[PDB]
């Protein structure tokens, strides 16, 4: 007496609900079925409209939490951000190590079973060599040569097509290299038959190639970022890379967050609303008004976001980054004044908030200009008015794109240190608590 979806031969068959979208009744089966790539739309339906269900379709390959610190260029970081909005779509890039790196960063961030699909077995070997960074323990190949199911499996369109069924329900992230190969009527079955919610296609071609770019948007998603080699050969490559660090919530912090997380999430889906950005919940609760439990929702959400940004772990991660850069100049930046002062107390770093006087502000910056203070923690210095002294390393505690442009501005003032080639702009991102999967002992 409960809805359940299960996987079979490249399709999802649903039993227990009939309004499930894209489902079609197979009179032979007696049950509704759809193409497996409708997984999201079906999973979204059950959780948006609050139908509790069993998931016997997804059988992910156990995958660790990857905290490789994949270094990206600015526009490559920009590319990653634009993809992550949907986590389903396509990118074009000038170079090929740039394509991989972006794919490499996305895999690092998502930490789910991932299937790369390339045209040729040469590439397949180049991907799986690049993917060594996450540990060859977790890299594998599934093609004619060998058939092994690792957290990071590389295959070819040809062997994936012949094997679309056995590969459908076992990865969460689906990467297509030189994606314009995908629209062939055989290769589309690769996409149409995997439940993989997240989909990245990498290419360099144009949007006018026989009209088959139309089927991509339906099965992988359409372009989210474009940059062809001519726009690179005209601008100077900024002298810094942007690494992303993923900091887990501690256990008790994850305990309390999930509490406040449950109250706001239960209230929002009870409403059934689709929030574009979490900041609109500060304002949607005011304008709508006429609600008693919406305060209790806002109070939990506000309480939840505060548990997440003050993460004890993020300051420990900042502690580790600071040891790593004892000789360099550093600007740490968040948007939370309490955190600016907390970082200052813990590590004895000058703080500059908007409550700082123009005297001490200019003192700090002149002492950072000279060798008197090797670091600053601040929530103002990236403003358009004042000019920051040069530095070698930036940290963004926030990690998020509430104010995305700050990541650009914080890059602007970075310069490589004496003895090293280029600078670094870390950004600390709060991801998981542990307990992601098993040890892959099955079969």
């Amino acid at each position: 007496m409960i809805a359940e979806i299960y996987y079979e031969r490249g399709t999802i068959v649903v039993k227990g609900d009939a309004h499930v979208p894209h489902a079609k009744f197979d009179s032979r089966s007696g049950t509704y079925r759809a193409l497996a790539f409708r997984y999201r739309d079906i999973i979204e339906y059950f959780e948006s409209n609050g139908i509790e269900f069993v998931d016997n379709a997804a059988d992910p390959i156990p995958t660790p939490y990857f905290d490789a610190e994949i270094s990206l260029r600015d526009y490559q970081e920009k590319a990653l951000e634009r993809w992550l909005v949907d986590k389903r779509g396509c990118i074009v890039l000038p170079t090929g190590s740039g394509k991989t790196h972006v794919a490499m960063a996305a895999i690092n961030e998502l930490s789910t079973p991932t299937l790369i699909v390339v045209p040729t077995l040469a590439l397949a070997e180049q991907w799986k060599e690049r993917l060594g960074i996450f540990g060859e323990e977790y890299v594998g190949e599934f093609s004619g040569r060998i058939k092994e199911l690792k957290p990071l499996t590389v295959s070819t369109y040809d062997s994936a097509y012949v094997n679309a069924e056995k590969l459908g329900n076992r990865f969460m992230l689906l990467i297509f290299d030189e994606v314009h190969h995908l629209p062939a009527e055989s290769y589309v079955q690769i996409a149409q038959m995997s439940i993989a919610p997240f989909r990245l296609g990498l290419t360099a071609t144009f949007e006018r190639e026989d009209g088959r770019h139309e089927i991509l948007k339906e099965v992988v998603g359409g372009k989210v970022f474009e940059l062809f080699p001519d726009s690179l050969a005209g601008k100077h490559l900024a002298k810094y890379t942007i690494k992303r660090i993923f900091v887990p919530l501690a256990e008790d912090e994850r305990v309390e967050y999930e509490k406040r997380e449950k109250v706001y999430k239960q209230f929002l889906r009870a409403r059934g609303i689709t929030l574009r950005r979490a900041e609109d919940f500060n304002k949607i609760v005011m304008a709508s008004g006429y609600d008693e439990r919406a305060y209790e929702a806002l109070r939990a959400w506000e309480e939840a976001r505060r548990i997440a940004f003050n993460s004890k772990n993020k300051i420990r991660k900042l502690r580790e980054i600071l040891e790593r850069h004892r000789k360099d100049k550093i600007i740490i930046f968040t948007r939370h004044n309490e955190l600016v002062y907390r970082i200052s107390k813990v590590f004895l770093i000058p703080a500059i908030t908007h409550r700082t006087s123009r005297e001490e502000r200019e003192e700090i910056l002149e002492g950072f200009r000279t060798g008197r203070f090797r670091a600053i923690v601040s929530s103002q210095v990236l403003d358009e008015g004042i000019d920051v002294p040069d530095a070698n390393v930036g940290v963004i505690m926030s990690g998020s794109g509430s104010a995305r442009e700050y990541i650009q501005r914080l890059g602007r003032i970075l310069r490589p240190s004496k003895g090293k080639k280029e600078a670094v702009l870390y950004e600390l991102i709060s991801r998981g608590t542990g307990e992601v999967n098993t040890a892959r002992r099955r079969k």
């Binding site: 500060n282 304002k283 709508s288 439990r293 040891e323 004895l348 403003d383 358009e384």
Partner: protein
Amino acid sequence: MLPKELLDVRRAKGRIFPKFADERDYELAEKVIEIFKKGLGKKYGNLMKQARKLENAKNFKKVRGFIRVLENHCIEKSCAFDVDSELEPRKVRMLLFEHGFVTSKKERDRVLEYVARYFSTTPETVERAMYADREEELILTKFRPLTPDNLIKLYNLSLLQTTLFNALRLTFWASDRHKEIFRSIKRLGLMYELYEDSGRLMVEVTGAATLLKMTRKYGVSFAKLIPWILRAKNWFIRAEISDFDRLYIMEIDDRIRDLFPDVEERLSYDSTLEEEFARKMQMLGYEVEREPDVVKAGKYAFIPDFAVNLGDKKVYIEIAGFWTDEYLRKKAEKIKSSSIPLILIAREDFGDGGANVKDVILFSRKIPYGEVIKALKRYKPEKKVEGDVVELENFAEVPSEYVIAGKYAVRREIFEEIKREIEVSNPSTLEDIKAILKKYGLGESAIRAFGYRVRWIGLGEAVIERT
């Protein structure tokens, strides 16, 4: 002044109206004032805490907006605090920060024990003193009473002007106080365009607030115009605010004047951004007569800042600060159309650098009093239509200065040919250069440019005769 997150607004179909506070809200506003009054000697954060326990599902948007606005006012204007420490927090923290940065408990303790030894104290006292002058750690000593009507009126003013800070552009009308509201516009220097349209004898004014660059700098001076507006007896304000896919529009009226505080002309602690109008009217006063206190407009309306006195007509000048490429092109096409002087000088070092204007443009720098003075010296008073000065030129009127010369002007090519003819023919006598030059356009006082000075080398001087 009030944060855009904690904004209490009614979201209409195509409109947006701020849910202002009124006497229905007196009782609350009194309750949040009383614990600041009754909590002298209390840590200012703990009062902040109490005031926010008075928060519930119905009042939260405004009991929080109250605490914010009262907090600002108390802090900035109407309160005095004590730091709950024997140590000066700036001293403690600079000595701490001067001892590098620490990445471990162990070296952190070393520097604390080091600073504690210096201040003849314990490390815990040093750790407390570090940021003891933070608002929430301060001790409230003197809160002067606010009447809850005051707080409510302030809340409405900041709530009004924070909505406007988020808007793209706004247009209004004012019955009285044009001049001083105008002067407030100019010192604030927001880009403007005044229109005598949709009304009679009514100047309608427009100005933008949601820019791409420096959006907050002038976003925070934009809302600094509004109390001068609200200072007139009548006003009809509408604005265009949008951060969604679509736009909302609000319109507030002078009938709401009873919801905002009374603010006479503040006019304190500034030069009013009239650096040039106040000091370089004197630099220009040596060259011509000037008047910084100007009020003028043509068929349409443009706000002058300075005036250049020429006898035929005067030259208006504007010295606004803010600018943008797309926003300057509209104000610039109007100055030439109406044929008004309207001298314009902007800040090329403060705004963003785009494409400078083709005909009329002025750049600025650290000391740009000359960079625009180059284009400005060319006041060009009626220099578009100029007649031929070759002949006529009041010839009948008076030939008193008409003895200079007699006939046409030479051509550079022909002049270059005669020069080439003169450099090679080898003349050494007056009677020798006269014949070579008389063949084409004879004239004695015409060796002006050939580099020859005629000289009488004989005994005595050169005689004359009557004609």
